[PDB]
């Protein structure tokens, strides 16, 4: 646990690293990887097939030029392009992600000098000092943040061409009407209501059922897609039992090949029927609607207004892009979406603190089932869970019913900080054998319920040193390897390929993350805050992993992610809360560090701090935030008449119509 | 403190309210009290001079005809005008504040059954019952209130005739720019970000030295009016020293009548030089204006819309009727509001807690110049600074910066609830010797805090018992009195009367007070719901107090009462949020009085509560709440529609162009 021993792991985990950097070097080589490792630019389609024409050499033959900016020179290069070119490249949601990475590096070196220079050679008011200091300057760098990113949302917004969403609105709980359909309550109510400017209207409709057989049909066709013209005839007819999928020859249906085609047709079958039974029911017409307007400054009038005096019907939001668009949670009722988050904030409870139990739970059933039919049980445990993390509460967002996918990633991305406050930082040792610190707080007589966890929670330095560099450098540096989107399109170009041209790609590498990503530097943005005034020696380790995962984040920008949405930075505000969040438990805990004895001309000082850091955060908010949740009047009519001066007979009535309607 | 104890102050005040009202009976008769006493009607123009006619007989010469029904049938005769009525002779703010007593009443006599047929037979989970029964019947009158007085607002606000306020928004903060003026900025964005329906506008100015010196001219011409008309020639040349007024023949400065007419004629002179440098200087404009248009569906929108990327720019909210606005801080910079909230918070701070050692100091003041120049301190102490409470309150108000009366009027409201909340109950007793309690938390090691103060804070039973029958019912009778205003007219039309007709009018009433009469409803709100789980003793006399208060207001809103602003119950979520602060505190209450050992089968459901009021009051403030701040777009159109089907060519340019001038 000394300096030492920390540095020796240190090293190891550089090393680690660098060993990544170099398969990257060798792998990115590889004609036939290409594909996997420059996805954006062929998706932008400035590079051609794969190896800049692709199937060439360069790859085992040479394997990788021995030098040392063979795993190195990547680095600069990712730090070449401009932002304004990268804006354009890739967009402003992964510009300003990138952003974070840089604003960890603008408030915790600063800082770390500050904490170097401070407590290791004087080593109390001190901390107190460092606190205040450390608290202005990440405020101070927030509010610079907060501003230029803003700025380059309406700076977007502004340059941005035409989209659906910016004439859009997304009316929910249309009040049910026994003698008009929704879309009838709809266009009257905006035709009375918004007369000047209403356009055309496009009625969500539940479409689920169809949707999911459509992905079904196309599931059914891919899956022995791969045995269907492995040798055609008759091939290995393989029996996936149907509960789970995936196995292969261990059911009973073998069947034929295209998983059966029978089963292909009578899947097209019930496509067929349901659409006969969504198009023509008017029952599956949800009481909501897609309202367009003639004006961007008449959707952000809908958008901002209250349209009726009960203010839980006819509600009006901006609408999502049409790709952002989540048309599943469409089809949910307003009154569900209520019910439904707090059973998912309960379930999220349960999640963050008693789930250590239910892995106990199956790592047992391992063992039993590792003796039927060398184990170890490694790889297991909880690693598995935090890798279905992000599902899990991706999963639980779609539940709780949020219709657009950024808005879901935020949401997945709030949950997991609040799991890792809990389970990361103060709250992982205090989870003592499962519940049974609650057990004691159910039988405390008193309140010692804070008393007894707060004491023992802090948890320690060189432990978390350990994981940043775990997690926070060699994490990163396998994110440059992009190891499992590489495994897929080999065993898919190679197994169910089957495409007349470029048709089978799955070479798409998605988009950064947001909801995994943001979490990462948001936990490390807290530990370093939270240790600043304390311990200078997780800064060091911190402003690693922010340089790393910039230039790593950036490389992947540029060159293989893909954003699924242009959201314009709307999640900064998320970003700045939950920085704020560090600063105000960062605050707190020195308070405690600092407050048992100590002396009278100190607490004052210590309340003082979260009250300025809360009216900071209340500044922002009625500063800055309003920014990315409510289109300006004079910026949408600025955009209004600019276009309606490039373009003087444009019909946006074609173009907004169509823009809604289900992709099914 | 026995209940016999307790039952014969009941009686004496009781007795003190009867007199009061035997009182009021006889007054009530003399014709020349009728202007006091049946103002409201007068100024309705329903009556005619005073005793239907003025000066008549049926005063002392018949005294009060001896009976029962002569203090008591004001009573029935206040119950007998219905509510619709009332809302349109004295106004929908003046119903609804009557509303809040029979909420009361609605409340509290249902849990009083309860406490009675529960607590008291058997005498614990029976306190934990009865708090949660309590509380749910509080929230769902709560709640039905809301719903009531939303739906009267939104009837009121359709029916309403055509008021300036509904086409109008007050835009602050107008970015100042070196080539046009606040005037023609405030035009030029109006006619581009709202250019289908911006009328016109009208620009702040800050006229206040005029009005100060307006209203000093009549105050000086009104100061020795009494004296200038007494005998005419050379009367008596009081000399109120000029440091205070009042006093006369005091000072130095004898001169001549009319306040020495030459100083009328000297600030009607300051008065033109003002005019010159007010109307032609453009440095009087505030960056403020008030913008009109033509529809009020158009203001609705501006009201509830962002217009600039700035969102402390050119801010717009519903403007005010131009009899509620408070013209004073109309002229406060947008930027010092908030430091003047700030420091009124902290004067507030010292208002509540640091007090009693002003008083003191006073007192002992009061004292040493008692000796000089049959004393006692009578009257003094605190009973003088709890009149003095509201106008302090007030002040306090008006230095934050709020440009409405009413909007003043429940700032103060709000304040004194916290001071009632602090000063009345949680922390009266816990003030030992003056902040000698604070003393030691200064020096306390550990948190202390909390734990010494909530100990001996709760406060007892039996003191409030008295509190409610001194303030609570012999004050509202005292309030039919109606003595300042009676004394106030008597020694004004006797003194500076010298009116043509009936030009010199110090009959008006004023109102009901929000500022002061809801804070009493609340506080009895707070001890009633506070004490019902542990004690059922405080809610008979509280139950009194609210039918009183309810048939003594009603009666003062239908005959004196004269509202100064029509706010269409804008206050009602306040109302609401306290009685909810009130609901809370009870249940943090009864947490402490039912935790300390008990058992954990209690707990789980003493935490319960204060969550299940708190997800009430949300959906309470999403349902009604909106109705209160903001106006639907479609009711705004259907009042709009109509208007202009009755009114087919209305100007109103004219109407709305004049209305807000500054009065001077």
Redesign the interface.
Known sequence: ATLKDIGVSAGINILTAFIFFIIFAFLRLQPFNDRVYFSKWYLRGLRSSPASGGGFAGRFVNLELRSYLKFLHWMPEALKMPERELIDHAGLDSVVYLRIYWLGLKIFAPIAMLAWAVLVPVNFWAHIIMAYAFTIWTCYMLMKEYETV?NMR?QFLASEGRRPDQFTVLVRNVPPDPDETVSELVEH?FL???P?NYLTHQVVCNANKLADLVSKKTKLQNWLDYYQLKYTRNNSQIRPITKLGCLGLCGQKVDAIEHYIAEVDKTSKEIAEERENVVNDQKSVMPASFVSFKTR?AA??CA?????????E?LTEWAAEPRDIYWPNLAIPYVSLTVRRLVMNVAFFFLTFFFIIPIAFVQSLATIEGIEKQGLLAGIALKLFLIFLPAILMTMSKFEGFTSVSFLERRSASRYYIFNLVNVFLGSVIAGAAFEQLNSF??????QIPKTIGMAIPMKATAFITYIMVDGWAGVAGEILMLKPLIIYHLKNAFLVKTEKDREEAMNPGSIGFNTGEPQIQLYFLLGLVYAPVTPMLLPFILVFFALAYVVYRHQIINVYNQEYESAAAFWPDVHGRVITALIISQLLLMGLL???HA?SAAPFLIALPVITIGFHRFCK??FE??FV??????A?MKD?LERAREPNLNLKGYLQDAYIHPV
């Open positions: 803003a309406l109510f009375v209501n918004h000047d400054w952000a009038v901002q207004t209250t349209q009726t005096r009960n203010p839980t006819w159910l039988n405390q007589s008193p309140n407050g048992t004895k009278a009625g500063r309003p920014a409510r289109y300006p009047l004079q910026e009519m008449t």
